[PDB]
Amino acid sequence: PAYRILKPWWDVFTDYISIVMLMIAVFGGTLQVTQDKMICLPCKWVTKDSCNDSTGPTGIKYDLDRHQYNYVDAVCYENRLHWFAKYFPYLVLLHTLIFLACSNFWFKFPRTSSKLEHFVSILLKCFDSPWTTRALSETGVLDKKEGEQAKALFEKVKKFRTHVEEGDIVYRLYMRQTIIKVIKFALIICYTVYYVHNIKFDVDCTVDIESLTGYRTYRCAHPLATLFKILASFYISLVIFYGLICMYTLWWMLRRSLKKYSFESIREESSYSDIPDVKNDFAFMLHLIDQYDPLYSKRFAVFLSEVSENKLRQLNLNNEWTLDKLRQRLTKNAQDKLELHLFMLSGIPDTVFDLVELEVLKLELIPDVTIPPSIAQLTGLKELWLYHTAAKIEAPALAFLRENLRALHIKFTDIKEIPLWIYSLKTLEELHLTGNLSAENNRYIVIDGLRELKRLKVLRLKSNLSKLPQVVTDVGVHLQKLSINNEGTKLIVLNSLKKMVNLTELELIRCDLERIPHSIFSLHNLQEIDLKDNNLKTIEEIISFQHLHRLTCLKLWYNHIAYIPIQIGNLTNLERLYLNRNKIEKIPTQLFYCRKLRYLDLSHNNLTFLPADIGLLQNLQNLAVTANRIEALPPELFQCRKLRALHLGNNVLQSLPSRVGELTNLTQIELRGNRLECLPVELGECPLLKRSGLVVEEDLFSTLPPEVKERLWRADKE
Amino acid sequence: PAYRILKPWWDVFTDYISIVMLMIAVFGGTLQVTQDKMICLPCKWVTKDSCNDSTGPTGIKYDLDRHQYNYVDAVCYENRLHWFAKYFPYLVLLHTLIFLACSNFWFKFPRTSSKLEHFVSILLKCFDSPWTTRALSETGVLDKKEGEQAKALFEKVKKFRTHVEEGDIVYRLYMRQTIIKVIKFALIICYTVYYVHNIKFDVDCTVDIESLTGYRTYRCAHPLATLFKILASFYISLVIFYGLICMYTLWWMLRRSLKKYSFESIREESSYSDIPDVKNDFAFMLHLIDQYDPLYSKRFAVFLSEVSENKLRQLNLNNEWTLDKLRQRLTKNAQDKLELHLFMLSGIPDTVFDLVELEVLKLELIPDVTIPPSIAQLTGLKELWLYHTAAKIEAPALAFLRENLRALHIKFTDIKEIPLWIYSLKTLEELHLTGNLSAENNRYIVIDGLRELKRLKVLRLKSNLSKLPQVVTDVGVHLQKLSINNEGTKLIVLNSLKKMVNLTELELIRCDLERIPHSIFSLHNLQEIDLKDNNLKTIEEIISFQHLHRLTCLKLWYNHIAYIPIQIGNLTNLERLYLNRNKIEKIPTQLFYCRKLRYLDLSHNNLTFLPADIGLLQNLQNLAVTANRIEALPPELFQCRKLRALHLGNNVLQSLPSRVGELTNLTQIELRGNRLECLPVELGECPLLKRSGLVVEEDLFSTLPPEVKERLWRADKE
C-alpha cells in the first residue's frame, strides 16, 4: 500500500511470476496427491529387462489378482518412478518460496527496513508538501503551522541524508539478492532442463518381485506424466522469464554506477544550481524511485538545495515577529527618535515595515539581506544603521531611500561589505564609516564616488588613515561637520584642509598629530575644534587662532598639556572650554579674560590653587576640577551666582567656604572624594540645590542640619 | 477507491467476459481432473486399423483383466486422444490469464501507474472544487483559504501538464496492449475453431501393444467429450465477443487520433477560448474520462483556463480588500483631496470602482495593470499617481482618462516601463515626471510626445537631466508652472528659458547653476522664483529683477549667500521672501524698501542684531530667525502690528523686551533653546497667543505669573 512506490517493474513482475509459480506448485501437488498412480503390466517374453512387443486375437492371461496388480503398481511407483516426477510440485514450491524470500529479504531485514520506511515516509511528505509546489512555481504568505511543519520536514531531510549517506547497506544487499536470484535461476534451469526428459508416459520396471507375483519386469504407464511434463515446461519458461528479468536488473545495476547520482538535470533547469550530487546508499534509493517515477525525485530535490533553506528561514521569520512584538521591542534612542534594533537574525522580518512610527532602523549581523520595497511603508525612516551587514537593495526601495533616507551608519571590516549603491543616496546628509580602508595600491579607491553626496553635511571616518583622502577634501566644499577617528594612526594633513572652507566643526580624535595644523586657522568659518588624544604639548598655535572670529568652543581634553599660554587672553570669543585630563599645573590670569565663557572643566590635572579671577567670569555655568590638588577655595568664586553646577570631586578641598549658599542658581554640586570636615549650613540655603543635586559622602551628609536634611529630601520627592 | 473511472464500458465488459471465461476454465479443469476416463474395448475383427463392425445372443469374451483394461485406457487416452480434448481447460485458463495481464498491465506497470494515479488524484481534486461550481454558475465572498487552494490547484495542474505532455507512454503502452489483445484473440479463435472438431465422443486407437493385451486396435468412448464440446463452443462464443469488443476499441483508438484533444465545445458553451490544444499523453486520459462521461472533463477544463483563474483570483482579492475595508483605509492627502493608497497589490481590486467619491488615486508596485473600463464609474476622479507601475490602457479607459483627468504623477525606474499612451491625452493640466530619462545619443526622444499636451500648465520634471530638453521649451510656449529638480545635476540653460513667456511660477531645485542666468529676466509675467540649494554665491542679477514687474515672491534659501545686495529693495512688489540657512550676517537697510513684503525667514544665519528699518515694513506677519546669534530683540520690530508668528527659538536671547504684548495679532511663538532667564508679563495679554502657540520650557514657563499661565491655558483649551 505504501512500499509499492519502491517496487520497480522488474520487482512486481517477479512477484506475479512467483504467484503463478505458487499456483503451479499447489496445482501439481494436489494433482499428485489426489491421484498419481502407475499402471503396470508384466512382460510375458522379456529380455534385457524389456519385452520386445511380439481365428481372431484373444486376450493375454496373466492370472493376477487385482491386489497383485495394486501391489505391483505401488512397488514400481515407489521404486522405478523418477524422483523428479514424484517431487516436482514440492520442488517448485520450495524454489518459489526461496524466490519470495529473496525478494522480501531487504524488506524483512530491519536494518534496511527502517531506512526504507523512513525514505518512503519522507518522500511522501516532500511530495505532498505545499512548500515544494510554490518553490517549483517560483523557479508569499503562509500559516504558522504549515511553515513550522515544513521546517521540521527540512531538518528531518537533513538528518535522513546524514544517516543514509554513510550506510551503504541497501546497495550491496540489493546486489546480493539479485546475484542470489540469478544463480538460483541458473542452477534451476540447468538441472530442471536436464531432468525434465526423465518423466515419460511409458516406463519400465524391474523390482525383483517374483515370490509375490511371479513376473520379473513390468511395462508401467504413468498417466500424469504428460501433464506433469507440460507443467514442468511451463514452469521452466516461467523461470526463464524470472532469470531474464533478474539479469536485466543486474545489468541496470552495472551500467551507470548507481552509487552516484548525477542530479544535474533538475538542478540546472530549475535554476537551483546549488543542489548536491547525491552519494552512496542515497543515490541508489533515488535511482529506485526514478525507476518508479522521477517526479518524486524532482519534488525531493528542493529539500537539498541549500537555498530553499534560506527562503523557508526568512519566511518563518516574517511569520514569527508580529507588529505588537516589534512595538514591544521598540525603543527610544539618545537622540529621541523611535528606534528598533535588529541583531543576529538571518534576515529582516517583513513586519518591521508595518511600523509607520519607526524613524531609525539598525541591522546588526544580518547576512545576505536585500531591502524589500515594502520599506516604502516606513515614512519616518531617516537613519539606517549597518552593523557589519553587507546588504543589497532593489530599484523601488533604492529610489524610496534615495528620496527619504537622511542618516546612514556603516560598520564594516571589509571594503566589499560596503553597499555600492549608497552613492546614489542623493538626499543623504550624514554618513558614519567604521572600519579600515587602506588597501595595498588600492587605498582610497572606493570613496572616489563621494562627490555624488551633494547634500552631505556630517561624515565619520574610523579607518586608521595616515593620509587624508583627496575625495574627502574635494567634497568638503559643503561639509559642515567632520569627525575622524584614526584610533592611534598618525594623520598627515599635507595641506589638504584649505578646500573644506564650509566646515563649521572639525574634530580630530585619536589622530596623533602632536601639532595643530595651520590650515585649521584658515577655516575662519570654524566654530568648534577638538584635538583629542593627539598628544599635544604646546598649544601656542592659538596665536594664529585670532583669525577665527567665530570660534566659540574649544576642547583639549585627554591630552598632555601642562600650561595655558597667555594668548588665550586675546581670544575672548570662547564660550565653552574643555581642558580636563591634562598635566596642567596652574591657571594664568590671561585665561580669565574671556568674559563670555560659560563652560569650564579642568579636571584630572596637577592644579593646586584657584586664582581669584575666576569670579570675573559671571556667565560660567559648570565647573570641573576633579582629580586635582586644590585644598582651599578663593571666596571670589562665589560671586558667580549663575554657576549651575561645579565639580570639586577627587580634590583635596579641606573646608568649603560658607559663601556657597549665595549661588542661588546653583543646582548641582560634586563634593565626594575630598577631605572635608563638615558641610557648611549655608549650603542648605540654596533655593535650587537639591539632594539630587547634592553629591557628597554620607558621613559629611549626616552632619547637615535636620532642616537642611528635610528640605533636600522634600526637594528630591517633588 | 474510484479507480474504475478510467475503465470504459468496454473494459468492464472485457473484465466480466474474462471472469466468465475463467469460470468455465476452472470448471472444465476440475472436471477433467476429477473424471476424464476413456473407456476402451478391443474389437476382434479389424479392417484398416478400425473395427469391421460385424440360439440367443451372448456376450463377447475378451479375456482381459480389469487392469489390462485400465492400461489400455491409459495408453489410448495418452496417445490417440487428440491433445485439444485433453488440454482445452488449461489452454482456456492460460488465455484468460494472458487477457487479464494485458488488461491490467498499465495499472500494474509502475512507470505509467504513477502518471495514471497522479492524473486521477488531480482530477478528483478538481471535481470537488467549489471554484468549479461558482465558475459554472456564473455562466459572493467566500473563505480566503478556498481561493488559495484554488490557486494552488491551478499551479499544480500547470506543473502536471508540463510534466505529462512530453511523455507519450500511456498511449503507446495502451495501444500495444490492445493490439496484443486483438492478435491473441485472432490466433486463439483460429486454432480453436480449427481444432474443436477433434472433440469426438468415440475414438479408434491403434497403439501397437501386443505383448501386453494381444489386441491390435481398440474402440474408445470419451464420455466427457460432448460436455467439453459444448464448453468449447461457449468459450468460442465468449472469445468472439471479447475480440469484437477489442476490435471496437481498436477502431475507437484509430479513428479519433487521440494524441490531440479537442477542447472545442468549451468556447461555444462557456465562451472560453483560453484553452490550448492538449498534446500527446494527456489527451489520452481526457478521452478516457470523456468516455466515462464528459462532465468531469468540462468541470476540469476550467482549471486549465488562465482567464478564469485570473478572474476568480481577482474575486479572492476582492474578498480580502472589501469596499468597507477600502473606506476604512481611505485617507485624505495634504491637498484636501480624497485619496486611497494601493501599495504592493497583485492586482487592482474590482470593488474600488464602487466608490465614486475618490478624486486622487496612487498606484504603486501593482504588476501588469490594464486600466478597466470600470474607471468610467468614477466620475469625480481627477488625479492619478503612477509609481513604478507600467500600465496598459484600454479604449474605454483611454477615452475616460483623456477627458476626466487633471493632474498626473508618473515615476519610473526605466524608459521601457513608461506607458506610451500618456502623450495622447489632451485634458491633462499637470504632468509630473520623476525618473532618470537621461539617454546617450537619443536623449529627449522618449518624451517627444510631450508636445501633444496642449492643456499642460503645471509640469514637474525630476529626471536628472543635464540640459533642459528642447521639446520642453516647445511645450513651454503655453505653460504656467515649471518645477525642475536635477538632484544636484548642473542645469544648462544656454538661451533655453527666455521662450517660456507664459510661465507663472518658476522653481529650480538643486539645479547647480551657482549663478543666476539672465534668461529669467525675459519672463516679465513670472510671479515666484525658487533656487533651493543651487549653490548660489552672487545674486547681483537682482538688479535686472526690476524687469519682472509682478514678481512678488523670492526663494533663494538653502544657498551659500553671505551678503545681501542693497538693490533688492528696488523690488517693492515682493510679498514673501525666505532667506534662511545662508551665510547672511547683516540685512541691508535698502532691502527694507520692499514695503509689500509679508513673509520673511532668516533662520540659521549669522545675524547678531536687527536693523531698525524692519520696523517700517508693517506688512510683515511671519518672521523667522530660529537658531541664530541675535543677542537681543530690538524694540522697533514691535511697530509691525500684524505679526502673527515670530520664529525666534534657539537664539542667544538674554532678556525678552516687555513690548511683546503690543502684538495683538501675535499667534505662534517658539522660544526653545534661548538663554532667557525671565519672561515679560505682557506676553500673557496677547489675545491670539495660546499655550501651544507659545513654545517655551515648562520650568521656564513657570516663570510667568499664575494668571498669565491660566489665561494661556484657557485660550489654548478651546
Numbering used by the authors:
A (entry chain D), B (entry chain C): 15 to 68, 92 to 176, 230 to 808
What does the paper say about this structure?
Members of the LRRC8 family form heteromeric assemblies, which function as volume-regulated anion channels. These modular proteins consist of a transmembrane pore and cytoplasmic leucine-rich repeat (LRR) domains. Here we address this question by generating synthetic nanobodies, termed sybodies, which target the LRR domain of the obligatory subunit LRRC8A.
To explore the relationship between inhibitory sybodies and binders that potentiate channel activity, we have determined structures of LRRC8A in complex with the sybodies Sb4 and Sb5. In contrast to the three inhibitory sybodies, which target each subunit of the hexameric LRRC8A channel by binding to the convex face of the LRR domain, thereby stabilizing distinct conformations, the complexes with Sb4 and Sb5 display a high conformational heterogeneity where the LRR domains are poorly resolved in a majority of 3D classes. In both, LRRC8A/Sb4 and LRRC8A/Sb5 complexes, the sybodies bind to alternating subunits as their epitopes are only accessible in LRR domains located at the r-position of tightly interacting domain pairs whereas they are hidden in the dimer interface in the l-subunit. The smaller interface and lack of aromatic residues contributed by Sb5 is congruent with its lower affinity compared to Sb4. Both sybodies target overlapping sites, yet with different binding modes and they bridge the large fenestrations between adjacent domains at the loose interface by approaching the juxtaposed l-subunits. In contrast to the stabilizing effect of the inhibitory sybodies Sb1 and Sb3, the two potentiating sybodies Sb4 and Sb5 appear to increase the overall mobility of the LRR domains, which is reflected in the poor resolution of the respective region in both complex structures. At such conditions, we found very low response in non-transfected cells and a pronounced, on average fivefold increase of currents in case of cells expressing Sb4 and an on average 2.3-fold increase upon expression of Sb5.
